[PDB]
Design a protein around this ligand. Sequence first.
Ligand SMILES: OC[C@H]1O[C@@H](O)[C@@H](O)[C@@H](O)[C@@H]1O
Ligand SMILES: OC[C@H]1O[C@@H](O)[C@@H](O)[C@@H](O)[C@@H]1O
Ligand SMILES: OC[C@H]1O[C@@H](O)[C@@H](O)[C@@H](O)[C@@H]1O
Ligand SMILES: OC[C@H]1O[C@@H](O)[C@@H](O)[C@@H](O)[C@@H]1O
Ligand SMILES: OC[C@H]1O[C@H](O)[C@@H](O)[C@@H](O)[C@@H]1O
Ligand SMILES: OC[C@H]1O[C@H](O)[C@@H](O)[C@@H](O)[C@@H]1O
Ligand SMILES: OC[C@H]1O[C@H](O)[C@@H](O)[C@@H](O)[C@@H]1O
Ligand SMILES: OC[C@H]1O[C@H](O)[C@@H](O)[C@@H](O)[C@@H]1O
Ligand SMILES: OC[C@H]1O[C@H](O)[C@@H](O)[C@@H](O)[C@@H]1O
Ligand SMILES: OC[C@H]1O[C@H](O)[C@@H](O)[C@@H](O)[C@@H]1O
Ligand SMILES: OC[C@H]1O[C@H](O)[C@@H](O)[C@@H](O)[C@@H]1O
Ligand SMILES: OC[C@H]1O[C@H](O)[C@@H](O)[C@@H](O)[C@@H]1O
Ligand SMILES: OC[C@H]1O[C@H](O)[C@@H](O)[C@@H](O)[C@@H]1O
Ligand SMILES: OC[C@H]1O[C@H](O)[C@@H](O)[C@@H](O)[C@@H]1O
Lengths: 106, 109, 109, 106
Amino acid sequence: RNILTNDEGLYAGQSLDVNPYHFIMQEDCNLVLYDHSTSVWASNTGILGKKGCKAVLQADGNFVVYDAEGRSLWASHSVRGNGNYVLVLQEDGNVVIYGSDIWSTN
Amino acid sequence: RNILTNDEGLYAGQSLDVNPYHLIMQEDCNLVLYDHSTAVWSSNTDIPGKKGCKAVLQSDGNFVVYDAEGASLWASHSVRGNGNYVLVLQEDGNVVIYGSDIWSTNTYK
Amino acid sequence: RNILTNDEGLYGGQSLDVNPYHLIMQEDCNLVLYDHSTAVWSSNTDIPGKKGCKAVLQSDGNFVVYDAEGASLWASHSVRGNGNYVLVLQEDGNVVIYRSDIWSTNTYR
Amino acid sequence: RNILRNDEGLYGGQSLDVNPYHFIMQEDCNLVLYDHSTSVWASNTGILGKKGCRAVLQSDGNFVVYDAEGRSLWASHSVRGNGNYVLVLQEDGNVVIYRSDIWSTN
Ligand SMILES: OC[C@H]1O[C@@H](O)[C@@H](O)[C@@H](O)[C@@H]1O
Ligand SMILES: OC[C@H]1O[C@@H](O)[C@@H](O)[C@@H](O)[C@@H]1O
Ligand SMILES: OC[C@H]1O[C@@H](O)[C@@H](O)[C@@H](O)[C@@H]1O
Ligand SMILES: OC[C@H]1O[C@@H](O)[C@@H](O)[C@@H](O)[C@@H]1O
Ligand SMILES: OC[C@H]1O[C@H](O)[C@@H](O)[C@@H](O)[C@@H]1O
Ligand SMILES: OC[C@H]1O[C@H](O)[C@@H](O)[C@@H](O)[C@@H]1O
Ligand SMILES: OC[C@H]1O[C@H](O)[C@@H](O)[C@@H](O)[C@@H]1O
Ligand SMILES: OC[C@H]1O[C@H](O)[C@@H](O)[C@@H](O)[C@@H]1O
Ligand SMILES: OC[C@H]1O[C@H](O)[C@@H](O)[C@@H](O)[C@@H]1O
Ligand SMILES: OC[C@H]1O[C@H](O)[C@@H](O)[C@@H](O)[C@@H]1O
Ligand SMILES: OC[C@H]1O[C@H](O)[C@@H](O)[C@@H](O)[C@@H]1O
Ligand SMILES: OC[C@H]1O[C@H](O)[C@@H](O)[C@@H](O)[C@@H]1O
Ligand SMILES: OC[C@H]1O[C@H](O)[C@@H](O)[C@@H](O)[C@@H]1O
Ligand SMILES: OC[C@H]1O[C@H](O)[C@@H](O)[C@@H](O)[C@@H]1O
């Protein structure tokens, strides 16, 4: 993985890997960005044992984490209406949600 | 590779590969999108004698092609404005360009 | 749906349905064939910690189950080489893969 | 419908469908493929009043169109030995026959 396409997601354990940096949806609903092994960013919604979480980039541009019972845990709050967006784990360590198709090769 | 952050580009012979699909700046200045081994899209800039071209994504969102010192042969025309763009060769095939950051963690190095 | 033309794919939570039969790709990587409610065939992959898999009909004739950005969980082993194949969930229940084209009206679009 | 298995067929008026695509065995005895109302392919064996025809996919892998009695009018001539086959009307507007089976679950 490296980029999550429109309406794609990460289940518990799955992650976005690029160099020592890794964005992961942990065993507890906590999304973290690690530099090697040091946590540098997290959604801070961690609750030991609370598994079955999903992190999915919705079509409206919102990035939401969901509880096993489909409830919202945390949301990026981008939601710029319907379109085509992508979340990329950049090599410079940043996580960016670039939105709205500007061009396409058909 | 697989992506192109604005200001990054493909030189005379480099590619972006998402397995069946391919995007390569061949040696004849022609930038084409293959499917396995079947041309599906083209820049149409393989002028005879011309060589050493480059595909370049930019800050203004324009995906341009160039030859000997500047001079654009082709240029998508997706010049939306100065921002942050990326050209990605998707899993489905379609080569898309995404317009400016909507949200980030601002955790750059 | 009841068919997969060559390089198609059954993604997490998707199925092929015909009469009371159903070849559904469950949440867990288990590919199962039911008779409305009873399981009558299985890939056998209800693996703990394996969510979101995909069953896809390969171009080489092989039908395999893939992990989330993973590998071969299951395989029909029906590898016969590259051509055109198809998997169908028939009304007699039997799910079959048919080896390459013999005749076509050549009416592609 | 959209598939014809070993020894299945179309009687005068029957057809396979999938979106605006239509493979039909008309009362003219002419097998035709229609995009909407526009014809696209045909056997060109039509005769007004020539009804009672049946198109049948066979074990030898042959798609034969038969007369009201029981004689050959047209045939794909895809005879490639006894086996199992299918004729599908694909979502791309093409009609193909597939050589035998290579894998089945039951
Ligand atoms: O149209 C695409 C086609 O153009 C030709 O001129 C060559 O450059 C080929 O390599 C390429 O596949
Ligand atoms: O986590 C991505 C990136 O975040 C910034 O804060 C950097 O200073 C490092 O901590 C790291 O490389
Ligand atoms: O044998 C089939 C059977 O396998 C179990 O492990 C579960 O996945 C059930 O949902 C399924 O019906
Ligand atoms: O060649 C057959 C094919 O031709 C296309 O032009 C369309 O008419 C389709 O509806 C049809 O399936
Ligand atoms: O903030 C980083 C830290 O946050 C929580 O404590 C947990 O999710 C840990 O696994 C993680 O290392
Ligand atoms: O906070 C989560 C919530 O945020 C916004 O309201 C929307 O994007 C919803 O789709 C999402 O579930
Ligand atoms: O045209 C842009 C749009 O095209 C297709 O729908 C897909 O490739 C989308 O992922 C992409 O954003
Ligand atoms: O503000 C978003 C912007 O932040 C930093 O400048 C970089 O990570 C860019 O790639 C990103 O687009
Ligand atoms: O049309 C080509 C032309 O388009 C815009 O003006 C810019 O992207 C220029 O850099 C480029 O040369
Ligand atoms: O192990 C299953 C294996 O079967 C065949 O070799 C191919 O379809 C491979 O792609 C697949 O991985
Ligand atoms: O030659 C038969 C072949 O024709 C085209 O390639 C496509 O419509 C395929 O689906 C089909 O199997
Ligand atoms: O040849 C195609 C043409 O054949 C006959 O004329 C008729 O059955 C028409 O409906 C059909 O379109
Ligand atoms: O040419 C028509 C003829 O072809 C083959 O011989 C067989 O399929 C026969 O059944 C059929 O009558
Ligand atoms: O799988 C081969 C063969 O098996 C059974 O005989 C039936 O289900 C046929 O429809 C199928 O073609």
